[PDB]
Amino acid sequence: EAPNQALLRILKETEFKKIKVLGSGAFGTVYKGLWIPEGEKVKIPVAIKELREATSPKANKEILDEAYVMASVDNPHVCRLLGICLTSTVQLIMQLMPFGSLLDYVREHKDNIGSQYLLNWCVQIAKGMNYLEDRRLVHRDLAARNVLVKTPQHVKITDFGRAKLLGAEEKEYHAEGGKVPIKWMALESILHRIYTHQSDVWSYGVTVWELMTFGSKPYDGIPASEISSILEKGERLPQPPICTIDVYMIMVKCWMIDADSRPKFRELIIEFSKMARDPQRYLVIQGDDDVVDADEYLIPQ
Numbered sequence: 001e002a003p004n005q006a007l008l009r010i011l012k013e014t015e016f017k018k019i020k021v022l023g024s025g026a027f028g029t030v031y032k033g034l035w036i037p038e039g040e041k042v043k044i045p046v047a048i049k050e051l052r053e054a055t056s057p058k059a060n061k062e063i064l065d066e067a068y069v070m071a072s073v074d075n076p077h078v079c080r081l082l083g084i085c086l087t088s089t090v091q092l093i094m095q096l097m098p099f100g101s102l103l104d105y106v107r108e109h110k111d112n113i114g115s116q117y118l119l120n121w122c123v124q125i126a127k128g129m130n131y132l133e134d135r136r137l138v139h140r141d142l143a144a145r146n147v148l149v150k151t152p153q154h155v156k157i158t159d160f161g162r163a164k165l166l167g168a169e170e171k172e173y174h175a176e177g178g179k180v181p182i183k184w185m186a187l188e189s190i191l192h193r194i195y196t197h198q199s200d201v202w203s204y205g206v207t208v209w210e211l212m213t214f215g216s217k218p219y220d221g222i223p224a225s226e227i228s229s230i231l232e233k234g235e236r237l238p239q240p241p242i243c244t245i246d247v248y249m250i251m252v253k254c255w256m257i258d259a260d261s262r263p264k265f266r267e268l269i270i271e272f273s274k275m276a277r278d279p280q281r282y283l284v285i286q287g288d289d290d291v292v293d294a295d296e297y298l299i300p301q
């Protein structure tokens, strides 16, 4: 019920210069690029997104909605929406995450530092979510894929297409149909489309399991239609090899059926925080020019 005094910044399409095409597909097309606030003497590196290329006026609904959310978040572990450009096709100008998705990164570099990296990432993602929990925001699509790498030491949560902001008396979002990422999703949601902050904890568990397994596919082989029952019988993802019981037990708590006996993000920070002060006790792995980054180009507005 608090007034969302966020500022939406509209950018002249001339101020920035597309440069290459990082990925394309469902989202549409993301372009590595560069933004030069005029008469400002900084060059800010950016991703520039547009959903494919067809008019589809229902699409701009969705773009302008993710832009609404991102405009309303500001945390060191959540993606910064920089502004939009009101071209025929509407574009989201976002901060460039130079190292790509965490999913890729862990896959590409299975020579990944032990918990120092792994458990540090676990802390930073819990901080990210706990913030959205303050902001009464429910991500509904937490996954290794949707976490970007600014540096190997600093990650941020992205992709707010499915995000929903709870009203001041909304425990759950009661969603319509659609294609949903079934393997990352609480059961109460897979069955009753009831999404919650605690449902987001479950997706945090699958994400952690993704990182601990260096990129494995949840329930690989299984067909998503099965998942609902599989998890109803009592089944869960396995204990990843490098995982001590201490870590694996935390993952398993995020996957309880009663969502109120699942742990809270503020606790997840604390616990992983503790573990990351003695990383090797918990994770066992063999061998352990005018540019300004956006995190320093603070509001000219």
Ligand SMILES: COc1cc(N2CCC(N3CCN(C)CC3)CC2)c(NC(=O)C(Cl)Cl)cc1Nc1ncc(Cl)c(Nc2ccccc2P(C)(C)=O)n1
Pocket (backbone or CB within 6 Å): 022, 023, 024, 027, 030, 032, 047, 049, 094, 095, 096, 097, 098, 099, 100, 101, 104, 105, 108, 148, 158, 159
């Ligand atoms: C500029 O660095 C990036 C590089 C890449 N690669 C991946 C491999 C990479 N190799 C070099 C660096 N290390 C060491 C790893 C390997 C080079 C090219 C990607 N692509 C992916 O990691 C997959 Cl997704 Cl192809 C991204 C970015 N950067 C970026 N920044 C902001 C956003 Cl908002 C974004 N979104 C975005 C971008 C693409 C697709 C989808 C999405 P969305 C809207 C759904 O989040 N990307």
